[PDB]
Amino acid sequence: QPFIPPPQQTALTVNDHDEVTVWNAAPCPMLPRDQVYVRVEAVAINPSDTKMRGQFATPWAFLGTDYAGTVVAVGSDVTHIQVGDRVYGAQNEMCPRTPDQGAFSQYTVTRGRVWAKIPKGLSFEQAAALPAGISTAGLAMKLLGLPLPSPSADQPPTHSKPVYVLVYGGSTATATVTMQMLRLSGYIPIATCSPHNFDLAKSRGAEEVFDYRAPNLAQTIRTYTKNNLRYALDCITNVESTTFCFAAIGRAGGHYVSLNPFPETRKMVTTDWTLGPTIFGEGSTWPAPYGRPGSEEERQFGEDLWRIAGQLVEDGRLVHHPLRVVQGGFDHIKQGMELVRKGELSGEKLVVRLEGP
Numbered sequence: 001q002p003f004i005p006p007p008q009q010t011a012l013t014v015n016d017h018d019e020v021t022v023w024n025a026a027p028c029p030m031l032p033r034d035q036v037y038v039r040v041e042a043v044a045i046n047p048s049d050t051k052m053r054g055q056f057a058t059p060w061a062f063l064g065t066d067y068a069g070t071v072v073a074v075g076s077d078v079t080h081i082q083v084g085d086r087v088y089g090a091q092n093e094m095c096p097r098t099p100d101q102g103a104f105s106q107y108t109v110t111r112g113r114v115w116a117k118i119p120k121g122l123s124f125e126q127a128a129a130l131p132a133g134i135s136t137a138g139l140a141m142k143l144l145g146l147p148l149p150s151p152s153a154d155q156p157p158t159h160s161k162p163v164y165v166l167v168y169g170g171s172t173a174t175a176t177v178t179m180q181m182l183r184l185s186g187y188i189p190i191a192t193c194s195p196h197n198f199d200l201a202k203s204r205g206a207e208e209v210f211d212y213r214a215p216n217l218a219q220t221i222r223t224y225t226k227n228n229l230r231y232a233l234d235c236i237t238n239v240e241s242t243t244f245c246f247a248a249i250g251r252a253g254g255h256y257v258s259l260n261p262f263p264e265t266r267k268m269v270t271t272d273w274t275l276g277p278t279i280f281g282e283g284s285t286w287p288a289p290y291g292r293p294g295s296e297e298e299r300q301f302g303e304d305l306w307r308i309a310g311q312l313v314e315d316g317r318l319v320h321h322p323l324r325v326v327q328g329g330f331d332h333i334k335q336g337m338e339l340v341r342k343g344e345l346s347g348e349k350l351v352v353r354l355e356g357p
């Protein structure tokens with residue numbers, strides 16, 4: 001009845017020589033009183049995994065954000081979950097004070113309340129594809145100053161004059177979850193991405209979608225939005241996406257939010273960027289002197305977000321990004337990361353269903 005974690009496990013990490021490495025003698029985490037122990041069944045690959053390298057990498061700390069798995073033990077201070085339940089959530093990868101916690105392990109623990117039970121109708125693979133998307137979508141809306149959806153409302157809030165939100169990179173894993181959430185809160189997303197993903201973008205909430213390569217496209221968008229676009233969410237964050245977003249924003253100003261720190265005007269634009277670890281209310285060691293401290297308000301926001309998003313996912317109002325599923329082990333995760341780093345996925349999320357053993 002007391003739970004004793006296995007003596008060692010396989011986990012994906014980074015070397016002393018900055019190489020991604022399968023480690024077959026990695027530690028297993030201890031079980032917090034307020035968390036559950038998870039045998040990991042599926043994981044999703046995120047670009048942020050592939051950037052944990054150089055001095056962003058903590059050698060021997062576990063990689064990986066998105067996991068879904070089977071509860072094999074339950075903390076003493078936890079009710080409503082039992083052994084055998086299925087959960088999905090986010091880990092805080094490569095955190096130096098919790099090196100034995102990451103999605104890319106055979107055994108992990110839930111973190112904070114940034115997790116939920118998998119609805120009866122979803123697979124481990126569908127559920128694993130969700131966590132970073134949900135967490136980022138909520139953090140982006142928070143930064144933009146937009147209320148999260150009500151899980152109990154019968155329709156989105158009404159706006160006789162549309163409130164537009166530009167989503168640059170409409171086929172990104174983050175944008176497809178975010179656009180559904182924006183629609184639920186009564187906003188009208190307009191998206192830019194490649195033509196082969198137009199159907200995908202519209203299916204996920206874009207009123208209209210445009211090829212970002214199209215000449216003078218920001219004039220088109222300005223006109224579409226009656227020269228009063230006040231919100232832009234940049235899911236790409238490079239020199240070109242930033243220029244484009246600034247150009248599309250209306251003459252009276254607006255708010256630009258990016259998913260990464262943005263590259264090296266007088267235009268009346270407020271700016272923010274999503275810091276992923278803040279979903280846990282934990283803080284970080286960048287950027288870049290002092291990092292950011294943790295905070296109970298950030299902690300409570302992530303818990304509120306996950307309670308809301310967990311229900312939306314439960315009732316079919318929030319759907320996962322299209323999947324590319326690989327059956328395999330930790331080498332398949334490492335191969336997965338290379339595919340993602342090389343920019344080789346479009347309109348799909350790479351999910352590894354773990355063959356145990």
Ligand SMILES: NC(=O)c1ccc[n+]([C@@H]2O[C@H](COP(=O)([O-])OP(=O)(O)OC[C@H]3O[C@@H](n4cnc5c(N)ncnc54)[C@H](OP(=O)(O)O)[C@@H]3O)[C@@H](O)[C@H]2O)c1
Pocket residue numbers: 046047048132136169171172173174175193194195197212235236238259260274275276277343345346347348
């Ligand atoms: N700070 C955080 O915690 C956090 C969280 C989530 C994401 N992010 C960052 O956000 C970015 C997106 O990640 P994600 O997982 O949401 O997306 P993703 O699924 O990896 O996005 C891939 C898509 O980006 C588009 N694309 C790639 N390069 C582009 C370019 N130069 N210009 C226009 N479109 C481009 C392609 O779309 P088309 O083929 O349709 O053109 C491709 O389908 C990554 O940089 C990631 O590191 C950060």
